[PDB]
Amino acid sequence: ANWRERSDLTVTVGIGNMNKDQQMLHLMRIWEMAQAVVGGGGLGVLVSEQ
Amino acid sequence: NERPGKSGIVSRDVQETVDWIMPSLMKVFTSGGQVVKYEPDTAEDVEQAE
Amino acid sequence: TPQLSGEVYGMLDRLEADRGKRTGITDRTRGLDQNTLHSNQAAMSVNQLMT
């Protein structure tokens, strides 16, 4: 279906999860948050292996 | 502003510019496949968007 | 002889930076550390500032 609608907002400083922001944000903040969740935050209730 | 018997040096003010848009934006454009994201429907996303 | 302007010597730095700016902006177009240390956190400032 033509759908008449298309978006390209995931490329740049827009929504755009660009490599620099993804690298820094993930590898620092989400790493710390995941270690905190695993350690004393919970394994079977919070963000789990799945 | 160039005449024989004197300096006729012209700066490459925009040569460097175009040689800066080439690599950075060429590589950001050719960064995996994040160029497109249809913002898919909730009912079906794998069959039509990705 | 007539006195030079006290910054012609530093004018080479700008042209050096420029023709590095063309393709080889890296300092000396080479990498060397003798006393400074590189710290690995996540691909060590990932992939050396993304190549």
- For A11-17, the CB contacts below 8 A with 24+ separation are A11/B28, A11/B34, A11/B35, A12/B28, A15/B37, A17/B34
Alpha carbon distances (Å) from C29 to A25, B42, C22, C36, C46: 30, 51, 12, 18, 20
Residues C39 and C30: beta-carbon distance below 8 Å: no
Residues A36 and A43: beta-carbon distance below 8 Å: no
Residue B20: alpha-carbon gap to chain centroid: 8
Q: Do C18 and B16 touch (CB under 8 A)?
A: yes
**Chain C residues within 8 A of A23 when measuring between CB atoms:** 42-43, 46
End-to-end CA distance of chain C: 48
CB-based contact, B19 to chain C, within 8 Å: yes
Closest CB to A10 among B28, B34, B48: B34
Closest C-alpha among A15, A9, C49 to residue B24: C49
Residues found in chain C: 51
The span from the CA of A12 to the CA of B34, in Å, is 10
- SS3 for B16? helix
The span from the CA of C23 to the CA of A39, in Å, is 47
Indicate which of A2, A3, A4, A22 best probes the interface with B, i.e. most B CBs within 10 Å of its own CB: A3
Resolution (A): 3.4
Token pair belonging to C13: 């730095």
